[PDB]
Amino acid sequence: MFERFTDRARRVVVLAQEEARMLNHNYIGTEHILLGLIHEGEGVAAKSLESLGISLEGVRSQVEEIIGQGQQAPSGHIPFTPRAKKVLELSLREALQLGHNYIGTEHILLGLIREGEGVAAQVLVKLGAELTRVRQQVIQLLSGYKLAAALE
């Protein structure tokens, strides 16, 4: 639920919508969630993806090559695809399974990996970030400086 999202995780969603709009896409899919995670730039998700060599411009290029740029930019809110909804539901599940009381960028990316079957997943693999490796990078950051920060 968005009430439990951190400020940074809410920004991921807002940026995902902007990324769909700039591509003239009429639904926010997992590929746009991925773009929002990268565009946010500072959280666990962005750091994990950067560490595997994934870039904002590379993902944008792949989305344009796989889906195609749309024809007119939509106005207003852009609805989630069914799969993007599933990913956001899984972000909540991932936090619950870990025992966490918040939803951060880490959990959005973990939910994306857990669903594992949409355009973001296709793009990640094509660009050299295996889904299991993305998950490992996220978990390693959680076990490291995130746990350190919580203990201080």
């Binding site: 968005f2 969603v13 807002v14 919508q17 809110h77 852009i78 609805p79 989630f80 539901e89």
Partner: peptide, 7 residues
């Protein structure tokens, strides 16, 4: 939640 945006 869970439609679009932060809804």
């Amino acid at each position: 939640x869970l439609y679009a945006x932060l809804x």
